[PDB]
């Protein structure tokens, strides 16, 4: 059976006048003003209105799908002068869809690292992780992709995971023992517009 | 009964993402990928697009309620490992949801007419008309109000008709054989932020 009984609204609204949800409507209704549409559940009443006369369903503040996603509501088409029920009660949800509006955040500012010295390449050195509040199950808005600011050559960083590994042969402890490498993870697939944060390693070669 | 096959699709979309439409679900569905959902109709494939995994569906183009306003589509879905359609086919409309793009346009820039120089106060002249392409049924987009701009006090205008009328032009002691009227008409009621068109009227006297 098909899933028809949702509204998809925008989270993050900014408009200048309420933002329009959808309209509730019963084949019954001739139009003739004798039908009242009525609204319950959760936030029926404030943060989502209805005209009475024509189902239009309105959103009255700001939504924030990473606070909230969904809202489970019940909508009844009765006679005005009667309340007699010409549709019987039906519950619906109000789906908040996803915008990129959360930036990846490091589960570390600073990560801690050693490796040893004359590794060859492609040896691990740690990983690192981003994470992003938005959508996973829609669009790129949470698809998180991992570059090297600062440590090219002597290191690299896996686009995907945020594994980082030695990328220099012969590099000697004796020469320099730490390295500082800064790691940006972007969101958007690193495609333009994406959002960024970084992440600071501090690595240090050992024998 | 309810009529819950509808998606609600705000007109004259900008951003730089595919806009979100709504997505089709079918409760056979385990979210095991083993569903693939298909869309057919109107507009299917060039200006709405689907992810046969989710259901998701957006919207490929800016679209415009007055150029259309709704779409019939035809929601399906197959078994990918049987090769068998696991849902009846089944119909749904996409309403394309009107903004306040439209301002009032006489139907002529240039309206010629005439009066008898000593008519009685009150005396029709012409009406003037500036239509609204915008949806008369949601909000003020389409509803106009006349004043004037030029030809007081010689001149009222019917603010919901546009009905010109003379006024004080029996006590202009200057003889003039010509008048210029310039009438105002403003959408949204006439309220603040309304959009708004012009046109202007040459009326002659007559014996
Ligand atoms: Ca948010
Ligand atoms: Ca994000
Ligand atoms: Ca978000
Ligand atoms: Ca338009
Ligand atoms: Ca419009
Ligand atoms: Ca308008
Ligand atoms: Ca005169």
């Given at each position: 059976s098909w899933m028809w009984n949702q509204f998809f609204l925008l989270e993050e609204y900014t408009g200048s006048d309420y933002q329009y949800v959808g309209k509730l409507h019963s084949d019954?209704?001739?139009?003739?003003?004798?039908?009242?549409?009525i609204l319950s559940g959760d936030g029926a009443?404030?943060?989502?209105?209805?005209?009475?006369?024509?189902?239009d369903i309105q959103a009255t503040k700001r939504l924030d799908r990473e606070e909230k996603p969904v809202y489970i509501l019940r909508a009844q088409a009765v006679n005005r002068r009667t309340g007699r029920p010409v549709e019987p009660e039906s519950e619906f949800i109000i789906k908040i869809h996803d915008i990129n509006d959360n930036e990846p955040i490091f589960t570390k500012d600073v990560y801690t690292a050693t490796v040893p010295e004359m590794a060859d390449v492609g040896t691990f050195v740690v990983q690192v992780t981003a994470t992003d509040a938005?959508?996973?199950?829609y669009g790129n808005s949470?698809?998180?992709?991992?570059?090297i600011l600062?440590?090219?050559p002597y290191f690299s960083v896996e686009s995907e995971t945020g594994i980082i590994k030695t990328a220099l042969l012969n590099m000697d402890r004796e020469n320099?023992?730490?390295?500082?490498?800064?790691?940006?993870?972007?969101?958007?697939g690193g495609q333009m517009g994406g959002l960024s944060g970084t992440t600071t390693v501090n690595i240090t070669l050992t024998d």
């Open positions: 019954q209704d001739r139009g003739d003003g004798s039908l009242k549409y009443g404030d943060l989502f209105i209805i005209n009475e006369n024509t189902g938005d959508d996973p199950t949470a698809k998180v992709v991992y570059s600062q440590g090219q320099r023992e730490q390295y500082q490498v800064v790691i940006q993870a972007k969101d958007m």
